[model samples]
Target: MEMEKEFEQIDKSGSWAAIYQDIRHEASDFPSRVAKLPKNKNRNRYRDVSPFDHSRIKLHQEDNDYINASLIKMEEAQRSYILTQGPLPNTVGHFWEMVWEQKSRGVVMLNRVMEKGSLKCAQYWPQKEEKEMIFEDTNLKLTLISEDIKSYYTVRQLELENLTTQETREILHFHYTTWPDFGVPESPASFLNFLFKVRESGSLSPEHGPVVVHCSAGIGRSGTFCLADTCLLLMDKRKDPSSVDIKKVLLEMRKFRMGLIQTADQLRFSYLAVIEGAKFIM
Candidate 1:
């Protein structure tokens, strides 16, 4: 009750925007060396989307170290995540290359393939019934082994094989179908359920490589998910729901990936989700 009241006070105070603005100003001054690399500038899905130099993931094979992807490490929670943009048609191969190199156990996709008549993400994975979807450019193939469809999300088992090395591994794909492009969920109940489902799969554990998280631009929805999850983990660890400072955690997360929690509404929703999730841990 006390923690909930504190969050209520924070929400009602309208301080989220100020916190978000401060983060933006701090991030603006942060160096983005990968985005400035001439050879990799065009690889970004959007003109403005770029990875921070300090935390950006660099490809071992590619000469230029630019993929619009950042490896966000939450030391407090012992969680590592790859926050990246939805793959463009030309960068689909590069996308898989990162997954393979990172040895990621699963991908948490928060956006649909298409939204508002625009291609938000490429059809990167194979259909459930299909044997495989091949990315000839990077000599990689993804085969759908199984799929479990739920009310608002789908879990898929995919086999990713490196054609060059003839090596293969199974990967999980969790796709949330209902999240809007630039909006929060209708309620926190369904969102928390989805988040717990991901946790149950052990994908977010440090035992595996960083889980790849993305929406269209991979900051707004992606940031919200990470923020809420990290806060809940802190609450669980400390056994004090109100002890975690949400604003400080978010600002630290932004150091790895620019422009997390895109809108004030998203920030508000994150607090709601965290407060709701704390109930379960409590």
Candidate 2:
């Protein structure tokens, strides 16, 4: 009902773009809390990407805690996610450090290594079977234990070790390869399937640390996935799929990670996926 009515309004000519622009305008001044961290300027994958001060994840036991990442916690749905930029060559160590410190159980990657002749993300994980990738700066090692390749996504079991502590943990790497930068997926069904697969792992549960979600900039596709999942969960919680305001939910999530649902198309697709997903939950 209410969500559908709002969705219809957004679907109208120019309405969606207007709403999208309004969000961008409101988020224009979100303080870049980590920009001046000196270390962050070096750690960020892109020149413009920086975590908002209010929600940025601070690393312990490190000289610098600034990483281009934010921790988004949804209290109502009991879900938490760390939204971060794809690692740069030098920042890969920082990426793993954040993972280890956060005690994250898994990572949901929404971009590919290369797209449109440009490198969207670093090959931050071990590429070869049983090969350990050493991040000298962080004194951590990542080894690939196994990989299950699929038509659109790949699931990998990775082992992350703290060289100093001699402690190790298994990390799940869920890579969705087909999503394009600043674009929606081919279909919501495929995207929902991927979402369910991640849920089945129980990494998104409250029992574990926040699940890390990233893309090239960590705001577009990453935002869509988080928003869609949050809304669907809320719908399931309330037992009324259309009772929640999709726009309000996105705006709340944006407070945690700026510029979520980057484009009108992404915002629109979020509604589609949430509505479609509600059917199943109902």
Candidate 3:
């Protein structure tokens, strides 16, 4: 399930990872032993990452009551995002269950299923060809309604249904197909184009549950995505959009989930994205 770790030290100085690590460690005082508890550890995809006890999404209403998810909120920006690790084989059902229970109207997947050779995420949704993915454990079915493929991203529509019940909902899957192992896209426009489309969709509004945002570790790429979006959101609300501090934004986000923007380049790109993408929000 490891993506391409040996490949991402573009910083050469390790300062990117180091500086960001400090940002996380400074707030690392917050917790997620909830993740290390004997009951939930195996459910996590990565060895080190987990949601803090405070920010961890609580499914206390359910049987197991644990899923490797963090409910990242920045009420300052009026933003609520569900940042989570990619689903493990056994946790796929739990992932979908979390989506249902949270009333999430959409999901933002930022990495490819197979990055270079290894699996980065569970083939969590139905195949465009197969038409359906069933979560037998939860009796939930995801029937594919439409899929739009682009050079840099793929957008799909889905119907979530409880086979034994009368509940059903439509869900959107915004998959950024071109994200690299670390952070090289030649230009950031492509990524913003993808995020722009996502923002265009109101799935992120409080009118729906927090939109689910995930990647392999749920912190690096996942955090990058939310950090950029929230910065732009803060910008959208301010009298002076330029007053938003991108670094401070990550610090705030790190409170919700530790170790965001795995590398400096990711943090670098977060600035690039939020600034570039801010044009339309105003």
Candidate 4:
């Protein structure tokens, strides 16, 4: 006798909460969001304050170089934590430049953001043989310089051949207001594995500054990653899987980082991300 075709489609909207409660399923990993400082948290308490300010689009003074060098070590030391914890370090301060800078002898900046408006500063010096990447790690977004990748190697190409086995293969899902000019997430596990190989072989660390995410005025896309990651952190901490509260968490994010999700579309997306995370946990 032939077996009957079997498939089950369950509509979860009406009883997701109850279903979650019944399973007693809890997140094994602490959510990334709850690790954030509360909204209205003071910056002085957390971030390092250099005597210099790079916000005005000026040349990197001696202080900027010092800070940048210091931050590089910090980046290396905290690399693992930044990936797992939150992108932003406890200390809050703005770097003077964009996301990525070109080095005199490197192949490519890879996910670097080019800075603008500083006509005379080292950040924009025409004659200087310097390439650099700048970003605010607090935001977890990146600003990429749109260049023709055909002529030179791009991160995507390098990542394809990268061969590091120690690195973890994470499902990095980004929500962009518009598709990023630089790169997008790959589909299928194989493509992701290829990228991971390239990343590992290249010894490519995620720069660990801040992600240079931005929209029209530097808010939407950037904030979503920041807030979403934060939410992930929180979800990990809840002992009861059913206790994850989306409304309270979203409100908390808005309070801490104003203008987090400005558009209704972004808000809707945030909710969906939570739903997706719930499915993953379940």
Candidate 5:
């Protein structure tokens, strides 16, 4: 069965032109939109806002810490359907359903809903008892940790619990960390260490290819890890690889996807994690 591809295009350029260009094609392939709503709707021209930087993802960043902070205080949505708030459902039902849809439409579906902690009624979805029962019956893997905040450990555990033993056996796990208060000089070493562990365990099979990572919103930690990996791979190939600067990457991405990292803190986390890992790699 073909899986739906949900691409969260993060455009750093805050120009309306960039955002419109990204969605000029279709809505389903890249759905949903978010940003700091304009304070004055009466303004004739849309002001160009700056894209968020990766440093906001760092652990020490206090400015962006408030984004989605309310989630810690509210209920988490567990339903599969795209209603209002909660973790956007990448896939709603059987994989075959997604496959069939994708096959018909030349474009793949990118369905993802994101909401930070909020009391806003727009993001609220009550858990239906029947659906919860179905999930329980199917042994749907719900994380033991609080699902309110998306985390790498929780996502991996949930995926493992849902997949068959064979699938689980082949899965590769990766953890991305960075101390943003520090600089971007520490990413490579820790990343290499992670790869070394994977290789020694004999689980670094080429089958899985790239590893998966999720932290909070799947943008901060995941994107930084992805960017670092891409840069390192190129560098290893003896290619004249440019320095892997995710802040620039995130800004480019946010132009299209509003709230790419949402708050600045998430962005800082990515910067911090990559640089911290670089120390080990360099």
Candidate 6:
């Protein structure tokens, strides 16, 4: 009610861009000392996008304990999300190691392997034919157990094994393939469908460590995913959907990971998705 009405008012006023810039200005820039080190240069996909040291997720088994990932924990929403960039060719093993050590049960991948003839993310998991991949550096093996393909997304069951100890854990991989780069999804309805599917899998709750959510850069679309999900959860918790301030939630998330919700349209889409998702809650 209040939330949807406020959205219409903002839309009628045609002032979303102004509000978007306000968020960008308020997010500011945070330090990433480890990401800028000479030895860790190639670990980053983009020079500008790096996780803040304080909130960065450190891999315990790795030598330097570094991975371009941030753990966004929101007390109000009672949710923890691991936001990371797409795995680089050299860092796939380290990525699996982080997943194993973190005890994460789900991996939310929002982008495709290729976009606009450019490489968005490396093929970090097993392919249809290969069925398995072994990482030498991390001493881990991953096998693709099952896959369910959908129009907008793909749900996969993957098993991760530690070569050292022989312990295995199954991880659900949610891949939303249709979301465009630097752009919002076609509709909030479709996006929410995928979000709910991920929720139904029970991988995002505290029962699991922290669900890993990543796009190519991990800030744009990835941030949008967390923002929309967190706001709706808060709205449902308070039973006052209008009281959930989307901007404040994004700013709070930005404190953990910089440059979330990259474009004005993305911020707008977050509102749209939250508004759409509110329907079910109401």
Best by TM-score: 6
Clashing pairs in 6: none
The most accurate candidate by lDDT is 6
What lDDT tens digits, residue by residue, belong to model 2 across residues 1-282? 567667777677558888888778766447885666665576776666677788888877546767788988888888889999988887899899999999899899988899888998788998897567999888998999999999889999999999999999999999997775546776788788999899999878878899999988998889989998898888778966667887778878878877787778888888889877877745
lDDT for each residue of candidate 5 in 120-230, tens digit (9 for 90 to 100): 111111233122211332222322211221221111111223422322111222223332322232333444444345345433234322122233343433344434444
> How well is each residue in 1-282 modelled by candidate 3, as lDDT tens digits?
111121244245445566656665665458677788887767988878878889888763556788889888797888799999989899998898899889998899988999889998888888774668888887888888889998889999999997878689999999998887755565678877777788788888888999999989888888878887787777778887667877777787787787887776776567657656765544
- What overall lDDT goes with each candidate model? 0.84, 0.84, 0.80, 0.29, 0.28, 0.89
Can you give the lDDT of residue 151 in candidate 2? 84
lDDT-best of 1 and 3: 1
> If the candidates were sorted by their lDDT against the true structure, best first, what order would they fall in?
6, 2, 1, 3, 4, 5
TM-score of each: 0.93, 0.93, 0.89, 0.34, 0.34, 0.96
lDDT, model 3, position 67 = 88
Clashes of each: 0, 0, 1, 42, 49, 0
Runs with alpha carbons beyond 4 Å of true place in candidate 6: none
lDDT of 1 by residue, 206-260 (tens): 7888899999999988998889889888887886656788878888898787789
Span of ten consecutive residues with least summed lDDT in model 4: 1-10
lDDT of 5 at 57: 15
Indicate the TM-score of model 3. Answer: 0.89
Task: Order the numbered candidates by TM-score, best leading.
Answer: 6, 2, 1, 3, 4, 5
For model 6, residues 233-275, the per-residue Cα lDDT tens digits are 8977895567788888888998999999887788788888888
